[PDB]
Amino acid sequence: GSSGSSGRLPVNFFKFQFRNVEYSSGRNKTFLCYVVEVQSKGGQAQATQGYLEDEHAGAHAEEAFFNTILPAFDPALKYNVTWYVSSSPCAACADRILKTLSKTKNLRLLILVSRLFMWEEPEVQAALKKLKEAGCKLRIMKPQDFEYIWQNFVEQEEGESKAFEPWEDIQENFLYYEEKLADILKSGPSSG
Ligand SMILES: [Zn+2]
Numbered sequence: 001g002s003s004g005s006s007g008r009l010p011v012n013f014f015k016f017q018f019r020n021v022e023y024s025s026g027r028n029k030t031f032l033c034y035v036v037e038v039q040s041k042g043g044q045a046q047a048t049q050g051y052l053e054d055e056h057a058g059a060h061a062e063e064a065f066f067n068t069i070l071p072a073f074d075p076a077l078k079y080n081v082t083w084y085v086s087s088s089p090c091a092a093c094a095d096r097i098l099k100t101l102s103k104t105k106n107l108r109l110l111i112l113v114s115r116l117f118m119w120e121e122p123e124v125q126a127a128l129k130k131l132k133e134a135g136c137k138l139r140i141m142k143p144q145d146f147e148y149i150w151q152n153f154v155e156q157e158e159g160e161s162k163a164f165e166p167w168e169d170i171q172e173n174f175l176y177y178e179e180k181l182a183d184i185l186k187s188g189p190s191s192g
Contacts, residue, residue, distance in 0.1 A: 018030075030087055033084040034070075035083075036081045062089045075104070079104070081108065081109045086113060088116050088181075094130070095127055097136065098130035098134045098136060113140065114140070114173075115141075116180035119181070119183065
């Protein structure tokens with residue numbers, strides 16, 4: 001939560017904040033965007049938005065969500081949650097997340113990551129699977145999703161208007177991380 005005024009971040013800052021890239025040494029704190037869309041047999045729907053802050057020692061940005069953002073959900077409505085981040089949830093972050101999907105059906109939780117993290121640990125594999133086995137939705141944060149999160153979850157200068165256009169690689173990077181996220185879901189037999 002830690003809400004205040006707006007539910008997005010100013011480009012002037014995000015530019016030096018979201019810059020946290022593998023090809024860049026020096027990180028401060030990453031923000032996790034969440035979008036929940038509920039519905040009642042067609043008619044009234046409640047849409048929520050905002051970023052969460054990871055706790056140095058307690059609840060990771062991911063948890064902070066269900067901690068205040070989505071505390072409870074009605075089995076009579078269709079909740080549509082969406083997470084837009086760059087770093088994948090740790091074996092613990094994806095935990096409290098799977099425990100929610102294994103109980104809530106009408107609730108559709110979604111999470112994207114432009115880059116896979118700790119996707120080589122024997123603990124994260126079994127911690128990320130449950131998500132795919134519980135009903136969670138995992139997808140490599142495509143270069144097309146950013147735009148929205150850049151024009152919505154991010155405030156643009158006044159009068160001006162830009163657009164995050166990754167001229168470096170749209171697929172090359174996707175396919176790369178794509179095999180990573182899936183890998184955990186697909187493990188080879190031990191015959192060595
Ligand atoms: Zn975490």
